[PDB]
Amino acid sequence: ASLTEIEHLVQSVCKSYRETCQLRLEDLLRQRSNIFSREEVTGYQRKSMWEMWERCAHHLTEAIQYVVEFAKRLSGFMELCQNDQIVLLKAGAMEVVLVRMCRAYNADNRTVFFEGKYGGMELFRALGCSELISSIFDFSHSLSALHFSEDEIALYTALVLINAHRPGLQEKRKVEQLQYNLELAFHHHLCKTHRQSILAKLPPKGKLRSLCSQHVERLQIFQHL
Ligand SMILES: COc1nc2ccc([C@](O)(c3ccc(C(F)(F)F)nc3)c3cncn3C)cc2c(Cl)c1-c1ccc(S(C)(=O)=O)cc1
Numbered sequence: 513a514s515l516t517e518i519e520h521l522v523q524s525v526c527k528s529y530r531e532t533c534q535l536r537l538e539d540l541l542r543q544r545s546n547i548f549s550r551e552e553v554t555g556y557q558r559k560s561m562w563e564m565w566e567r568c569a570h571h572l573t574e575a576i577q578y579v580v581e582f583a584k585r586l587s588g589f590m591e592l593c594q595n596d597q598i599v600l601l602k603a604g605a606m607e608v609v610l611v612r613m614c615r616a617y618n619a620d621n622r623t624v625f626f627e628g629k630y631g632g633m634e635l636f637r638a639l640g641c642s643e644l645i646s647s648i649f650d651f652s653h654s655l656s657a658l659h660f661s662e663d664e665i666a667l668y669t670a671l672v673l674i675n676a677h678r679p680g681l682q683e684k685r686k687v688e689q690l691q692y693n694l695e696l697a698f699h700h701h702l703c704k705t706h707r708q709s710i711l712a713k714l715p716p717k718g719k720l721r722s723l724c725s726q727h728v729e730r731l732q733i734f735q736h737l
Pocket residue numbers: 533534535536565568569571572575612613614615616624625626627628636639641644645648649727730731
Protein backbone atom coordinates (compact mmCIF):
# COMPACT_ATOMS: atom_id res chain seq x y z
CA ALA A 513 0.00 0.00 0.00
CA SER A 514 2.56 2.57 -1.17
CA LEU A 515 2.12 6.34 -1.34
CA THR A 516 2.57 6.34 -5.11
CA GLU A 517 0.05 3.50 -5.38
CA ILE A 518 -2.41 5.51 -3.28
CA GLU A 519 -2.05 8.57 -5.51
CA HIS A 520 -2.42 6.36 -8.59
CA LEU A 521 -5.71 5.02 -7.27
CA VAL A 522 -7.00 8.54 -6.65
CA GLN A 523 -6.19 9.57 -10.21
CA SER A 524 -7.70 6.35 -11.52
CA VAL A 525 -11.04 6.85 -9.76
CA CYS A 526 -11.18 10.50 -10.83
CA LYS A 527 -10.43 9.55 -14.43
CA SER A 528 -13.07 6.82 -14.35
CA TYR A 529 -15.59 9.34 -13.06
CA ARG A 530 -14.73 12.12 -15.51
CA GLU A 531 -15.25 9.55 -18.26
CA THR A 532 -18.71 8.58 -16.99
CA CYS A 533 -20.00 11.84 -15.53
CA GLN A 534 -22.79 11.92 -18.13
CA LEU A 535 -23.01 15.73 -18.16
CA ARG A 536 -19.98 18.01 -18.12
CA LEU A 537 -19.91 20.43 -15.19
CA GLU A 538 -19.06 23.45 -17.35
CA ASP A 539 -22.16 22.75 -19.44
CA LEU A 540 -24.35 22.57 -16.34
CA LEU A 541 -22.87 25.79 -14.97
CA ARG A 542 -23.25 27.62 -18.28
CA GLN A 543 -26.94 26.73 -18.42
CA ARG A 544 -27.75 28.14 -14.97
CA SER A 545 -28.69 31.32 -16.84
CA ASN A 546 -31.34 29.35 -18.74
CA ILE A 547 -34.47 29.03 -16.60
CA PHE A 548 -37.96 27.67 -17.32
CA SER A 549 -40.60 30.33 -17.90
CA ARG A 550 -43.83 30.25 -15.90
CA GLU A 551 -45.59 28.85 -18.97
CA GLU A 552 -43.00 26.13 -19.56
CA VAL A 553 -43.25 25.04 -15.94
CA THR A 554 -47.04 24.89 -16.16
CA GLY A 555 -46.42 22.64 -19.15
CA TYR A 556 -44.80 19.99 -16.97
CA GLN A 557 -47.41 20.48 -14.26
CA ARG A 558 -50.29 19.59 -16.59
CA LYS A 559 -48.80 16.23 -17.56
CA SER A 560 -50.26 13.19 -15.81
CA MET A 561 -48.17 11.57 -13.09
CA TRP A 562 -47.57 8.63 -15.44
CA GLU A 563 -46.18 10.93 -18.12
CA MET A 564 -43.69 12.45 -15.69
CA TRP A 565 -43.07 8.94 -14.38
CA GLU A 566 -42.05 7.61 -17.80
CA ARG A 567 -39.87 10.69 -18.33
CA CYS A 568 -38.08 10.39 -15.00
CA ALA A 569 -37.72 6.61 -15.24
CA HIS A 570 -35.91 7.03 -18.56
CA HIS A 571 -33.75 9.74 -17.00
CA LEU A 572 -33.02 7.43 -14.07
CA THR A 573 -32.36 4.46 -16.33
CA GLU A 574 -29.88 6.37 -18.47
CA ALA A 575 -28.16 7.67 -15.34
CA ILE A 576 -27.75 4.26 -13.72
CA GLN A 577 -26.16 3.08 -16.96
CA TYR A 578 -23.41 5.65 -16.45
CA VAL A 579 -22.89 4.44 -12.89
CA VAL A 580 -22.45 0.94 -14.30
CA GLU A 581 -19.77 2.22 -16.67
CA PHE A 582 -18.08 3.91 -13.72
CA ALA A 583 -18.15 0.83 -11.48
CA LYS A 584 -16.75 -1.35 -14.26
CA ARG A 585 -13.79 1.03 -14.44
CA LEU A 586 -13.02 1.00 -10.72
CA SER A 587 -9.83 -0.98 -10.18
CA GLY A 588 -10.60 -4.52 -9.03
CA PHE A 589 -14.37 -4.30 -9.48
CA MET A 590 -14.50 -6.44 -12.63
CA GLU A 591 -12.32 -9.09 -10.99
CA LEU A 592 -15.11 -9.82 -8.51
CA CYS A 593 -17.56 -12.70 -8.78
CA GLN A 594 -20.60 -11.73 -10.86
CA ASN A 595 -22.75 -12.19 -7.76
CA ASP A 596 -20.95 -9.51 -5.75
CA GLN A 597 -20.84 -7.22 -8.77
CA ILE A 598 -24.63 -7.33 -8.99
CA VAL A 599 -25.07 -7.08 -5.22
CA LEU A 600 -23.00 -3.89 -5.06
CA LEU A 601 -24.72 -2.22 -8.01
CA LYS A 602 -28.31 -3.08 -7.06
CA ALA A 603 -27.47 -1.86 -3.56
CA GLY A 604 -25.65 1.33 -4.47
CA ALA A 605 -26.49 2.42 -8.01
CA MET A 606 -29.44 4.62 -7.00
CA GLU A 607 -27.43 6.18 -4.16
CA VAL A 608 -24.62 7.12 -6.55
CA VAL A 609 -27.08 8.64 -9.02
CA LEU A 610 -28.51 10.70 -6.18
CA VAL A 611 -25.09 12.00 -5.15
CA ARG A 612 -24.26 12.89 -8.76
CA MET A 613 -27.45 14.95 -8.95
CA CYS A 614 -26.02 17.78 -6.83
CA ARG A 615 -24.03 18.78 -9.91
CA ALA A 616 -27.31 19.77 -11.52
CA TYR A 617 -28.58 21.68 -8.49
CA ASN A 618 -28.15 25.45 -8.25
CA ALA A 619 -28.20 26.45 -4.58
CA ASP A 620 -28.57 30.16 -5.32
CA ASN A 621 -32.13 29.80 -6.61
CA ARG A 622 -33.00 26.26 -5.49
CA THR A 623 -33.39 25.00 -9.05
CA VAL A 624 -32.38 21.78 -10.79
CA PHE A 625 -31.39 21.30 -14.41
CA PHE A 626 -34.00 19.22 -16.22
CA GLU A 627 -34.41 18.55 -19.95
CA GLY A 628 -32.72 21.70 -21.22
CA LYS A 629 -33.34 24.22 -18.44
CA TYR A 630 -33.28 24.91 -14.71
CA GLY A 631 -36.52 24.70 -12.73
CA GLY A 632 -37.70 24.63 -9.13
CA MET A 633 -39.32 21.66 -7.42
CA GLU A 634 -42.78 22.83 -8.59
CA LEU A 635 -41.60 21.36 -11.89
CA PHE A 636 -42.23 17.82 -10.64
CA ARG A 637 -45.61 18.71 -9.12
CA ALA A 638 -47.53 16.17 -11.20
CA LEU A 639 -45.91 13.19 -9.45
CA GLY A 640 -47.53 14.17 -6.14
CA CYS A 641 -44.21 13.26 -4.51
CA SER A 642 -43.60 16.75 -3.12
CA GLU A 643 -42.40 15.26 0.17
CA LEU A 644 -39.72 13.15 -1.50
CA ILE A 645 -38.63 15.70 -4.11
CA SER A 646 -38.21 18.29 -1.38
CA SER A 647 -35.92 15.77 0.30
CA ILE A 648 -33.90 15.39 -2.90
CA PHE A 649 -33.43 19.17 -3.19
CA ASP A 650 -32.34 19.39 0.45
CA PHE A 651 -29.73 16.66 -0.01
CA SER A 652 -28.37 18.29 -3.16
CA HIS A 653 -28.45 21.69 -1.49
CA SER A 654 -26.35 20.64 1.49
CA LEU A 655 -23.78 19.02 -0.80
CA SER A 656 -23.82 22.07 -3.07
CA ALA A 657 -23.27 24.27 -0.01
CA LEU A 658 -20.07 22.34 0.71
CA HIS A 659 -18.81 23.19 -2.78
CA PHE A 660 -18.47 19.46 -3.49
CA SER A 661 -15.82 19.00 -6.18
CA GLU A 662 -15.75 16.58 -9.13
CA ASP A 663 -12.90 14.58 -7.57
CA GLU A 664 -14.69 14.49 -4.21
CA ILE A 665 -17.84 13.13 -5.87
CA ALA A 666 -15.75 10.52 -7.70
CA LEU A 667 -14.11 9.24 -4.52
CA TYR A 668 -17.22 9.40 -2.35
CA THR A 669 -19.42 7.52 -4.82
CA ALA A 670 -16.68 4.93 -5.30
CA LEU A 671 -17.08 4.33 -1.56
CA VAL A 672 -20.87 4.22 -1.86
CA LEU A 673 -20.67 1.38 -4.38
CA ILE A 674 -17.81 -0.59 -2.86
CA ASN A 675 -19.50 -1.46 0.43
CA ALA A 676 -18.33 -4.74 1.95
CA HIS A 677 -21.29 -4.62 4.35
CA ARG A 678 -23.86 -5.26 1.62
CA PRO A 679 -26.04 -8.32 2.33
CA GLY A 680 -25.43 -11.12 -0.16
CA LEU A 681 -21.70 -10.75 -0.75
CA GLN A 682 -19.82 -14.03 -1.21
CA GLU A 683 -16.23 -12.81 -1.53
CA LYS A 684 -16.62 -10.29 1.31
CA ARG A 685 -12.96 -10.05 2.34
CA LYS A 686 -12.13 -9.37 -1.31
CA VAL A 687 -14.35 -6.29 -1.24
CA GLU A 688 -13.14 -5.24 2.21
CA GLN A 689 -9.71 -4.88 0.64
CA LEU A 690 -11.17 -2.70 -2.12
CA GLN A 691 -13.06 -0.60 0.42
CA TYR A 692 -9.98 -0.02 2.59
CA ASN A 693 -7.84 1.04 -0.36
CA LEU A 694 -10.45 3.52 -1.62
CA GLU A 695 -11.03 4.95 1.86
CA LEU A 696 -7.29 5.53 2.19
CA ALA A 697 -7.30 7.25 -1.19
CA PHE A 698 -10.33 9.39 -0.34
CA HIS A 699 -8.86 10.69 2.93
CA HIS A 700 -5.33 11.16 1.60
CA HIS A 701 -6.78 13.33 -1.16
CA LEU A 702 -9.05 15.39 1.10
CA CYS A 703 -5.87 16.24 3.00
CA LYS A 704 -3.81 17.05 -0.09
CA THR A 705 -6.56 19.53 -1.03
CA HIS A 706 -7.07 20.70 2.56
CA ARG A 707 -10.73 19.65 2.54
CA GLN A 708 -10.83 17.03 5.29
CA SER A 709 -13.20 19.29 7.23
CA ILE A 710 -16.19 18.41 5.01
CA LEU A 711 -16.27 14.97 6.65
CA ALA A 712 -18.01 16.32 9.76
CA LYS A 713 -20.40 18.33 7.58
CA LEU A 714 -21.32 15.44 5.30
CA PRO A 715 -24.87 14.07 5.60
CA PRO A 716 -24.91 10.71 7.46
CA LYS A 717 -24.65 7.60 5.28
CA GLY A 718 -27.87 6.21 6.73
CA LYS A 719 -29.72 9.24 5.39
CA LEU A 720 -28.35 8.33 1.95
CA ARG A 721 -29.94 4.90 2.34
CA SER A 722 -33.03 6.33 4.05
CA LEU A 723 -33.68 8.76 1.21
CA CYS A 724 -33.14 6.10 -1.46
CA SER A 725 -35.24 3.43 0.23
CA GLN A 726 -38.04 6.00 0.40
CA HIS A 727 -37.26 6.72 -3.25
CA VAL A 728 -36.99 3.09 -4.38
CA GLU A 729 -40.34 2.33 -2.71
CA ARG A 730 -42.08 4.75 -5.08
CA LEU A 731 -40.56 3.08 -8.15
CA GLN A 732 -42.07 -0.24 -7.08
CA ILE A 733 -45.48 1.45 -6.93
CA PHE A 734 -45.30 3.27 -10.27
CA GLN A 735 -44.68 -0.02 -12.09
CA HIS A 736 -46.81 -1.22 -13.51
CA LEU A 737 -50.37 0.07 -13.13
C1 LIG B 1 -35.02 16.22 -8.44
O1 LIG B 1 -35.80 15.28 -9.17
C2 LIG B 1 -35.06 14.86 -10.26
N1 LIG B 1 -34.14 15.69 -10.75
C3 LIG B 1 -33.42 15.30 -11.80
C4 LIG B 1 -32.47 16.15 -12.31
C5 LIG B 1 -31.71 15.79 -13.39
C6 LIG B 1 -31.89 14.57 -13.99
C7 LIG B 1 -31.03 14.21 -15.15
O2 LIG B 1 -31.35 12.89 -15.55
C8 LIG B 1 -29.59 14.25 -14.77
C9 LIG B 1 -28.86 15.40 -14.91
C10 LIG B 1 -27.53 15.41 -14.55
C11 LIG B 1 -26.98 14.25 -14.05
C12 LIG B 1 -25.54 14.26 -13.65
F1 LIG B 1 -25.32 14.96 -12.51
F2 LIG B 1 -25.04 13.01 -13.44
F3 LIG B 1 -24.74 14.82 -14.60
N2 LIG B 1 -27.67 13.12 -13.90
C13 LIG B 1 -28.95 13.14 -14.26
C14 LIG B 1 -31.30 15.07 -16.32
C15 LIG B 1 -32.16 16.12 -16.53
N3 LIG B 1 -32.05 16.62 -17.80
C16 LIG B 1 -31.12 15.88 -18.37
N4 LIG B 1 -30.64 14.94 -17.51
C17 LIG B 1 -29.61 13.97 -17.83
C18 LIG B 1 -32.84 13.71 -13.49
C19 LIG B 1 -33.60 14.07 -12.41
C20 LIG B 1 -34.57 13.24 -11.87
CL1 LIG B 1 -34.83 11.69 -12.58
C21 LIG B 1 -35.32 13.62 -10.78
C22 LIG B 1 -36.31 12.77 -10.18
C23 LIG B 1 -35.89 11.64 -9.53
C24 LIG B 1 -36.80 10.80 -8.92
C25 LIG B 1 -38.13 11.11 -8.98
S1 LIG B 1 -39.31 10.04 -8.21
C26 LIG B 1 -40.02 9.18 -9.58
O3 LIG B 1 -38.54 9.09 -7.42
O4 LIG B 1 -40.33 10.87 -7.61
C27 LIG B 1 -38.57 12.24 -9.63
C28 LIG B 1 -37.66 13.07 -10.23
